[PDB]
């Protein structure tokens, strides 16, 4: 998986044109993520390739099989100048010369990346949810006065384009999430928007499983341990599979809360539907405290254990 970075002495203009093509809905094909990575690199490392290659982001991406193939040009002022002559890029090129040049402005790259970041909290849910959420966030930050997005970015078509770009692109998601988490707390509005989005993205797609896990746990000053009902013979397989899925998730470390969004490996079975009995136990224990588990419906077959879990928690 070869990622092409574009290297010129007109990086800002090239980048803004990559944003032009992306926003136009033009399919960049196998250059998409390469283009995206260039943007990120121009933004966070000011196109210093040596500073990037030694970064945790490049570290991780290389550790995940990505190979960086830099295309040095310069004198190239135009994204069109930079695409290989190779004929499987013919339609791309054909579309790109129909591109209007919005003269490169300052902060438009950060503008773009923050916009993208607003789609993250509900990305795994779907386009409707991700986009609705994005719009509500847009109005939030707008009325904060911290940032104003162009209104034509708010049409449903354009936001479907962006949603798509995030879906297809692993690198974009990873860079935005990594920087959301690790980038400090300076004086760049876009970094704080991205940070806020990533903060709202934590455990996206994994909150039900998380809370079920929370509620089959038992606080004892002898450490902390599993619920006794969890340790019956009927629930010997659910606990096995759950422990295994949880280990797989745990592999991903600090990226574990974002593992569903980034589509990380090992998450197949981290889906509460597969664990009815543990869900029953957790909902019981939850009820006994008043609060409840959102998104968890116990079918008849496990209603008994549900009360079995319920009453016993109230007698404690």
């Amino acid at each position: 998986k070869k990622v092409i970075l574009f290297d010129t002495n007109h990086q800002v203009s090239i980048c803004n044109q990559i944003i032009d093509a992306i926003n136009s809905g033009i399919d960049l094909g196998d250059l998409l993520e390469g283009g995206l990575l260039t943007l990120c690199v121009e933004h966070y490392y000011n196109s210093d390739k040596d500073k990037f290659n030694t970064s945790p982001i490049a570290k991780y991406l290389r550790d995940a099989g990505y190979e960086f193939d830099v295309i040095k040009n310069a004198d190239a002022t135009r994204f069109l100048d930079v695409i290989p002559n190779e004929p499987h890029y013919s339609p791309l090129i054909l579309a790109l010369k129909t591109l209007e040049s919005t003269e490169s402005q300052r902060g438009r790259i950060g503008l773009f990346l923050s916009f993208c970041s607003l789609f993250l909290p509900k990305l795994v849910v779907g386009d409707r949810a991700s986009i609705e959420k994005a719009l509500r966030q847009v109005t939030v930050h707008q009325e904060q006065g911290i940032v104003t997005y162009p209104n034509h970015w708010l049409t449903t078509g354009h936001m479907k384009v962006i949603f798509g770009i995030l879906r297809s692109s692993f690198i974009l998601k990873f860079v935005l999430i990594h920087q959301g988490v690790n980038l400090v707390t300076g004086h760049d509005a876009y970094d704080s928007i991205i940070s806020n989005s990533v903060g709202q993205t934590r455990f996206s797609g994994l909150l039900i499983v998380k809370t079920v896990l929370e509620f089959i746990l038992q606080k004892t000053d002898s450490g902390v341990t599993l619920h006794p009902l969890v340790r019956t013979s009927k629930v010997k397989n659910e606990v096995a599979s759950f422990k295994q899925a949880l280990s797989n998730l745990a592999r991903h470390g600090e990226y574990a809360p974002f593992a569903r969004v980034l589509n990380l490996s090992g998450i197949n079975n981290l889906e509460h539907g597969l664990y009815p009995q543990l869900s029953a136990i957790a909902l019981g224990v939850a009820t006994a405290h008043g609060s409840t588990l959102a998104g968890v419906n116990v079918g008849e077959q496990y209603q008994q254990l549900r009360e079995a879990a319920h009453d016993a928690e109230v007698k404690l």
Partner: peptide, 23 residues
């Protein structure tokens, strides 16, 4: 709550799963 920290730490790998599950 507070245990929420336990579930999350189990999930991020900050808490060994063997502490809570064992063997």
């Amino acid at each position: 709550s507070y245990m929420q920290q336990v579930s999350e730490g189990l999930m991020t790998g900050k808490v060994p799963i063997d502490q809570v599950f064992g063997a």
